[PDB]
Amino acid sequence: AVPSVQTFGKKKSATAVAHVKAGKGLIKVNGSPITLVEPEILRFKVYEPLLLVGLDKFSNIDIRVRVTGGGHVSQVYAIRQAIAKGLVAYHQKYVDEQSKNELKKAFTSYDRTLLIADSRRPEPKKFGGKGARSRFQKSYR
Amino acid sequence: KKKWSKKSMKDRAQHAVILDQEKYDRILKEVPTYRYVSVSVLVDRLKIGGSLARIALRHLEKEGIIKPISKHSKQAIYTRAT
Amino acid sequence: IKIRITLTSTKVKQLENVSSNIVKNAEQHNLVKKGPVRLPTKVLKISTRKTPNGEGSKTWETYEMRIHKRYIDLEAPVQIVKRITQITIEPGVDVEVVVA
Amino acid sequence: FTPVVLATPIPEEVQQAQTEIKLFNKWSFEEVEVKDASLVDYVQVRQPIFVAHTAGRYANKRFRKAQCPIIERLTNSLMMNGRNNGKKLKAVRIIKHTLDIINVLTDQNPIQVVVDAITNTGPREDTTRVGGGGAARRQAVDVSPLRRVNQAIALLTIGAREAAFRNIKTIAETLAEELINAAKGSSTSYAIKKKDELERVAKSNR
Amino acid sequence: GRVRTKTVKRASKALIERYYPKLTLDFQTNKRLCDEIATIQSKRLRNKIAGYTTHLMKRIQKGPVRG
Amino acid sequence: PGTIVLYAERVQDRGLSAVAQAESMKFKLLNGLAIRRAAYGVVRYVMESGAKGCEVVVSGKLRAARAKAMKFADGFLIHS
Amino acid sequence: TPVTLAKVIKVLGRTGSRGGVTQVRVEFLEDTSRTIVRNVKGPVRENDILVLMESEREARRL
Amino acid sequence: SLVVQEQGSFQHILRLLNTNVDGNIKIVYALTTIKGVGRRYSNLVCKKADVDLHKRAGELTQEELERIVQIMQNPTHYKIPAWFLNRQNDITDGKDYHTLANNVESKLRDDLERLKKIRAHRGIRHFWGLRVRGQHTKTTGRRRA
Amino acid sequence: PGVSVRDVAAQDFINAYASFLQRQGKLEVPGYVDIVKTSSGNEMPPQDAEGWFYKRAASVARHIYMRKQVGVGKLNKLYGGAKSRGVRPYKHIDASGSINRKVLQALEKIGIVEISPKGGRRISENGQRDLDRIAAQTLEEDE
RNA sequence: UAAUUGCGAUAACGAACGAGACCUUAACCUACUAAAUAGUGGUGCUAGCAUUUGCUGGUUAUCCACUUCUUAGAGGGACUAUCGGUUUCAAGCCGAUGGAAGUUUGAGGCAAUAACAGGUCUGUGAUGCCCUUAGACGUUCUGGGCCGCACGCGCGCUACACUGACGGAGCCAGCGAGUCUAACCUUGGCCGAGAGGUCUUGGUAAUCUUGUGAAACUCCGUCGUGCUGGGGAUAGAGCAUUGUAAUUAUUGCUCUUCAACGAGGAAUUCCUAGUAAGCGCAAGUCAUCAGCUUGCGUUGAUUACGUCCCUGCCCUUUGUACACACC
Numbered sequence A: 001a002v003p004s005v006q007t008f009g010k011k012k013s014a015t016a017v018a019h020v021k022a023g024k025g026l027i028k029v030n031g032s033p034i035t036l037v038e039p040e041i042l043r044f045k046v047y048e049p050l051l052l053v054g055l056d057k058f059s060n061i062d063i064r065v066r067v068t069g070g071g072h073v074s075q076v077y078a079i080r081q082a083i084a085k086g087l088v089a090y091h092q093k094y095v096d097e098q099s100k101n102e103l104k105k106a107f108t109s110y111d112r113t114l115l116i117a118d119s120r121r122p123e124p125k126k127f128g129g130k131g132a133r134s135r136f137q138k139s140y141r
Numbered sequence B: 001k002k003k004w005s006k007k008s009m010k011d012r013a014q015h016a017v018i019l020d021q022e023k024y025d026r027i028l029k030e031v032p033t034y035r036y037v038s039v040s041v042l043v044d045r046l047k048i049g050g051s052l053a054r055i056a057l058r059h060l061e062k063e064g065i066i067k068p069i070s071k072h073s074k075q076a077i078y079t080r081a082t
Numbered sequence C: 001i002k003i004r005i006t007l008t009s010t011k012v013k014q015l016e017n018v019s020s021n022i023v024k025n026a027e028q029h030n031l032v033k034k035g036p037v038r039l040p041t042k043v044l045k046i047s048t049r050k051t052p053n054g055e056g057s058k059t060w061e062t063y064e065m066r067i068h069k070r071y072i073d074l075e076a077p078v079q080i081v082k083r084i085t086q087i088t089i090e091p092g093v094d095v096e097v098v099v100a
Numbered sequence D: 001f002t003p004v005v006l007a008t009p010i011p012e013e014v015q016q017a018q019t020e021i022k023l024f025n026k027w028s029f030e031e032v033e034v035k036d037a038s039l040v041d042y043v044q045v046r047q048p049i050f051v052a053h054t055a056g057r058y059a060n061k062r063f064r065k066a067q068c069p070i071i072e073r074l075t076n077s078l079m080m081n082g083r084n085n086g087k088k089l090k091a092v093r094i095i096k097h098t099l100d101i102i103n104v105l106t107d108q109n110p111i112q113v114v115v116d117a118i119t120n121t122g123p124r125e126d127t128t129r130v131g132g133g134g135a136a137r138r139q140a141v142d143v144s145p146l147r148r149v150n151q152a153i154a155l156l157t158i159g160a161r162e163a164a165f166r167n168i169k170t171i172a173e174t175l176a177e178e179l180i181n182a183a184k185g186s187s188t189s190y191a192i193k194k195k196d197e198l199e200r201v202a203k204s205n206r
Numbered sequence E: 001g002r003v004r005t006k007t008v009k010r011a012s013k014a015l016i017e018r019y020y021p022k023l024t025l026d027f028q029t030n031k032r033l034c035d036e037i038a039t040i041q042s043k044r045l046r047n048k049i050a051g052y053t054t055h056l057m058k059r060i061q062k063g064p065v066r067g
Numbered sequence F: 001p002g003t004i005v006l007y008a009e010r011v012q013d014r015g016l017s018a019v020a021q022a023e024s025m026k027f028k029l030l031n032g033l034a035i036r037r038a039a040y041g042v043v044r045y046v047m048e049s050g051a052k053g054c055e056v057v058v059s060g061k062l063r064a065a066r067a068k069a070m071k072f073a074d075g076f077l078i079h080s
Numbered sequence G: 001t002p003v004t005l006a007k008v009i010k011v012l013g014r015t016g017s018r019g020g021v022t023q024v025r026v027e028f029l030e031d032t033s034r035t036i037v038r039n040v041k042g043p044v045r046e047n048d049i050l051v052l053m054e055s056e057r058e059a060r061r062l
Numbered sequence H: 001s002l003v004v005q006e007q008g009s010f011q012h013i014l015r016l017l018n019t020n021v022d023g024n025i026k027i028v029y030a031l032t033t034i035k036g037v038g039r040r041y042s043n044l045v046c047k048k049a050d051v052d053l054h055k056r057a058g059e060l061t062q063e064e065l066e067r068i069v070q071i072m073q074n075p076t077h078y079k080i081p082a083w084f085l086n087r088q089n090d091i092t093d094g095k096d097y098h099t100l101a102n103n104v105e106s107k108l109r110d111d112l113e114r115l116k117k118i119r120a121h122r123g124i125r126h127f128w129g130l131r132v133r134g135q136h137t138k139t140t141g142r143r144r145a
Numbered sequence I: 001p002g003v004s005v006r007d008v009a010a011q012d013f014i015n016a017y018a019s020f021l022q023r024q025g026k027l028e029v030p031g032y033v034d035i036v037k038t039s040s041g042n043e044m045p046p047q048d049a050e051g052w053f054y055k056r057a058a059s060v061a062r063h064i065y066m067r068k069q070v071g072v073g074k075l076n077k078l079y080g081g082a083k084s085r086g087v088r089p090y091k092h093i094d095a096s097g098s099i100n101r102k103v104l105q106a107l108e109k110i111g112i113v114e115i116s117p118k119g120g121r122r123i124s125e126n127g128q129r130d131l132d133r134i135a136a137q138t139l140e141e142d143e
Numbered sequence J: 001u002a003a004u005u006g007c008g009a010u011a012a013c014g015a016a017c018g019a020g021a022c023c024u025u026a027a028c029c030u031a032c033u034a035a036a037u038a039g040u041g042g043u044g045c046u047a048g049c050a051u052u053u054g055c056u057g058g059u060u061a062u063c064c065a066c067u068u069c070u071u072a073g074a075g076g077g078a079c080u081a082u083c084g085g086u087u088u089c090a091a092g093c094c095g096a097u098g099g100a101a102g103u104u105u106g107a108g109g110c111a112a113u114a115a116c117a118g119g120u121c122u123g124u125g126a127u128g129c130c131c132u133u134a135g136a137c138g139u140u141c142u143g144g145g146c147c148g149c150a151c152g153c154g155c156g157c158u159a160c161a162c163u164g165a166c167g168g169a170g171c172c173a174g175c176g177a178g179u180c181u182a183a184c185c186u187u188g189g190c191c192g193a194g195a196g197g198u199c200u201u202g203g204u205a206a207u208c209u210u211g212u213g214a215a216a217c218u219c220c221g222u223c224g225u226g227c228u229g230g231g232g233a234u235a236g237a238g239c240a241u242u243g244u245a246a247u248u249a250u251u252g253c254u255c256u257u258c259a260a261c262g263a264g265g266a267a268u269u270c271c272u273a274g275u276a277a278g279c280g281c282a283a284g285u286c287a288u289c290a291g292c293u294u295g296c297g298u299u300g301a302u303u304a305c306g307u308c309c310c311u312g313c314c315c316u317u318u319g320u321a322c323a324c325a326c327c
């Protein structure tokens, strides 16, 4: 057996299951490396867990993610949460907390939702209006 | 049938599309002393059209007069090569 | 054999009771089986205007029937098998057994 | 700096932007100190972001919007006037092009230009309405530092939107010349002209 | 508003009146014992009652309280 | 044929049945009994059988061209 | 163009019929420990710093 | 990429099919000012007449022009699949035509006075100046003239 | 080091394969090129027009390599768009079926894609071979 | 206090309904039970590139292991917890910390007493009375009309453009529906520019349609401030589908014609976060027809966190010549 963990990152409806094991350290997004997410502005949003901790920590571990659901923006935030969660959970299972403790305050001081999925969920649409809160229009004369 | 306004017209600018030899060499000396070159730069200046402002912009690349920093479509940003 | 028992009730308490009796029947009949596989609950929504006529504020109303489905795969001779069909019947519980 | 190769080929530019200095796409968040007082810790610098897109939540509390970076606040005001509601990826791309144009012209830091634009065009006095009765009357009041920043972002983005409407100039360059003129002070930007006429009304209605 | 209703307050008052040599200033052990010492139909009500008893233990430990 | 059978059972707690009491109120009114007298007997019978509260409402034309409603009840009933 | 910086030290309350104007008392950084009362259009917090075109003002409720 | 200087043979607005064809803009949209030629027909006519679409119509020599208007007036000879045509199976001869500059409103009037003189519903609807395609006329088309 | 179609960017790969098939020029010409709109929602034909049977063939070649099997029905869903139905609001409409069918029939002729069980078409060894070579060509042109 | 919510005071004590409590739903669970009708990893067979270990795949009777992601059943969790202030210092309130979640956690369902001479006899084989009952106001057939247009209004949809239009590429959801004495949702192959037609297939359904490859979106290109390639009303010719039947065009398609509209006057509506707004999709009615509604997802702002000025609501005091009650 090989040292392997698995995590998931979440968004509105996008889930990204990341398989983190030991190896040379390729990172793949559903078939393809990190440089080909292609919003090309949220591409640098996905580099953010990697660029915060240095690329030396990723030299021993390879991560493969499978992202479904949501849209293009929401899938990006599912990846960047799954990368940080998978990196932490590997350092839970196999190496010391001294990496972990400096990993988590590096994440949480910068951006909180790197490790935790945000609680904002859609509100149901209500009758008498097009949206959750709005109404149609009132007429009197 | 009420306008509820006056709807004043415009000045009817007459930007020419095709260039000529007098307009050809005009962009050669005058592209230097522009600190920033784009399609909108070459239209608010001398009155060539937007399409030739793209074609003559790509023309300046194969020889090299002005330098790139970004090559996004719909916004081409171009500075002077010193 | 590879028969399946599918339960499609709308009351969850009797359906879990019937499912529990079936899986505890095969347990004392020492049979290696597929567990109670739980399908997603079907929510049948019907939205209607509350008003009989068309007067008043446009107030709507969504009635809803929740159907819960569960199936267990079992592998036993027919003399055993016909007796699960004989037992474990509850009100509002639809019990079906198919072969292969 | 140390070049590290890896199974997926990491470019050097994203490597240099990672370890050397935490940047924008190419811009730095240092030496961007705001010279104008009373607006410190209400314009957000020293908190770096790589891109203006962040899924933060600042509408939960009252003064939480002050902690949002001023680049992201500019992109949020850029997506306005109806059909541009949402579409934040266009707002970031417009801002990225705008900061490039603020680099080739007026070669100082584009982050330093926008924070000078915010501070110069922020109205320090304005007028409210008293109970008019027969006729409404204006009364001059002072402006909070939060509202000074909020008015500055709104005035800059409105003037750029009106300038780019129905003309050949794009939204990126019209916003750039609005931010350049507001940082200088010229009474030709729409932001400055609205500020002085608001303070003139406040002066005559004390 | 987090004002507690009289059903929570009186259920807390009856437990304080009756089981002082018992549940303490920790909410977790109070919830784990007020569930069996009182038949409460709702988990939301049980946490509300156990919460207010703990608030009453804190009040009791600093002087007497009325009622 | 043979797939249908019907069983008849005596209903437990005859006083604790709204549908049995509604028909008891229904046939008493068309027999000729007073509306107040028929309701008060039904409301008395429901709590005598071991209920917590009862309420009978009669609506329609009673002794007048104009229609109204009277509500006979005792005990307590929840609504929400 | 003389301007004067003042620091909000205690928020007094809302004023104006529609409630949009806040009564505050402010402490001047220069010429320390002499304080006046002003009116603020926007959201004003403790330790906010105000700049005033003129400091010769008392605040009366609108 | 490359920019030619200018030709002495460039001309402003020109004459085809007794229409005032606007020069100064691109050829595909230049032929669209001719009534009977839209965006699809002008794009296809220029494709079969092997002119480059990038060139402005104000600069074009002779022998391409009457070649272009020949394909216009004789479409089916130059491999037009007859579902591009405006007026196919006409009303009289069953053939496939493509009406043009002074023909489009000509065939418009003669269909109408035929429809008026046959006393069909569409004729008297056009005679009265009302909507004919079944549109509601209670609340629309009020400022009709 | 191992080259796949996933290893290179999508946009420059399709451009490379369309240019390669332009440089070769051997697929098919259906006959009704430069007359068709490629969907019911389009209103005027593709602006390129010296091709686009080769951009479309390149796009479906990568797309077949992506998935297991597609038919003409899945391609019309993919290449459809919002149709401006005049005054009425926009709606998704399907793409034109004859182009995608004749692309696949042309794609079958060379041997770049083959028929499959469970319906549809599927990449094979010779098919993905030509895909993988230019995929290797696609990332050495940066050098 | 959101709350006749509570502290308390007290000629009142003990009560009841409403509020709350309750129920449903969205969040967390790497803790339980499992799951070829959901998946994941490994092992077989096999395709390719590099070949040096590897990468990307395919594979139903190839097995093995597991439930993190996915579905449920049973549960746990949050009670404003801890800390710091403020209040007769009681109910509480404010800030920070931890937490998935600390605006009664979010959104609903239920919802008192008394009423309106509100709406509905055109939902009912629910109805009292009045009318009509064989040239019937019964029912049924045929053809029309409900759409008719000198105009006035209400809810809406497209827009007046470069934060754009168009063409290529890129490429992602969720709610949900579907055939029996019927003929449904349709995959795949073939023909046709298109709409659509034909030969089949799967599915009574977490299995098949369907990963509903949705649209706004991203990236390359063309145009270029011109009522212009903006916008697509009004017309003309033809090709198909539904239906016995489409003529006052049902709808879809192809070509042509290319009107107002240059941001909207007096006025007026909705809205405090995944909300407004932009964008589509499913269902409802349905043989055909969404510019409507009920919901769902995608992208996702600005600006207060207040007040009683306007329009109204609740409680107390007060004056009243008001009682179908300030109309």
Ligand SMILES: [Mg+2]
Pocket (backbone or CB within 6 Å): A130, A131, A132
């Ligand atoms: Mg909405």
Ligand SMILES: [Mg+2]
Pocket (backbone or CB within 6 Å): D163, D164, D165, D166, D167, D168, D169, D170
């Ligand atoms: Mg403009």
Ligand SMILES: [Mg+2]
Pocket (backbone or CB within 6 Å): I079, I080, I081
């Ligand atoms: Mg497309």
Ligand SMILES: [Mg+2]
Pocket (backbone or CB within 6 Å): J059
């Ligand atoms: Mg295999």
Ligand SMILES: [Mg+2]
Pocket (backbone or CB within 6 Å): none
């Ligand atoms: Mg609630």
Ligand SMILES: [Mg+2]
Pocket (backbone or CB within 6 Å): J120
């Ligand atoms: Mg009725």
Ligand SMILES: [Mg+2]
Pocket (backbone or CB within 6 Å): none
């Ligand atoms: Mg009748």
Ligand SMILES: [Mg+2]
Pocket (backbone or CB within 6 Å): none
């Ligand atoms: Mg009608």
Ligand SMILES: [Mg+2]
Pocket (backbone or CB within 6 Å): J155
């Ligand atoms: Mg309405």
Ligand SMILES: [Mg+2]
Pocket (backbone or CB within 6 Å): none
């Ligand atoms: Mg597009």
Ligand SMILES: [Mg+2]
Pocket (backbone or CB within 6 Å): none
């Ligand atoms: Mg889905």
Ligand SMILES: [Mg+2]
Pocket (backbone or CB within 6 Å): none
């Ligand atoms: Mg158009």
Ligand SMILES: [Mg+2]
Pocket (backbone or CB within 6 Å): none
């Ligand atoms: Mg739109």
Ligand SMILES: [Mg+2]
Pocket (backbone or CB within 6 Å): none
């Ligand atoms: Mg429908």
Ligand SMILES: [Mg+2]
Pocket (backbone or CB within 6 Å): J292
């Ligand atoms: Mg309707």
Ligand SMILES: [Mg+2]
Pocket (backbone or CB within 6 Å): none
């Ligand atoms: Mg109002």
